[PDB]
Structure 1
Amino acid sequence: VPSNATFKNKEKPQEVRKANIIAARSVADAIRTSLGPKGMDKMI
């Protein structure tokens, strides 16, 4: 069953998409504390 069909090459985009999701979720974590009536203000 293996050794046939095709083999995945240039796997860097698989890592680039992971690096983009992790970096985007890190920004969403700081704003998450401001959600709802119990949220807090962010001083910048």
Structure 2
Amino acid sequence: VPSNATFKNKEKPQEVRKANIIAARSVADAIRTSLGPKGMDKMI
């Protein structure tokens, strides 16, 4: 059950995908406050 089959290598892509999701959800949080009739305008 252990020690057999295969072992995962180069686990950085697992962290790269996490860094891409966290950075994308951070952008979606600022625009989330503008959703619906109760949303607010964003001055840039």
Per the shorter chain, which TM-score range?
over 0.9
Unpaired segments ≥5 residues, structure 2: none
Deviation at 1:41, TM superposition (A): 0.0
Q: Between the two proteins, what is the percent identity of the paired residues?
A: 100
TM-score in terms of structure 1 length: 0.99
Unpaired segments ≥5 residues, structure 1: none
Q: Tell me the alpha carbon deviations over residues 1-44 of structure 1, each in whole angstroms, 9 at most, x when there is no partner.
A: 10000000000000000000000000000000000000000000
Structure 1 moving runs of 4+ over 6 Å: none
Provide the rounded CA distance (Å) in 1 between the counterparts of 2:20 and 2:38.
Answer: 29
CA RMSD of superposed structures (Å): 0.2
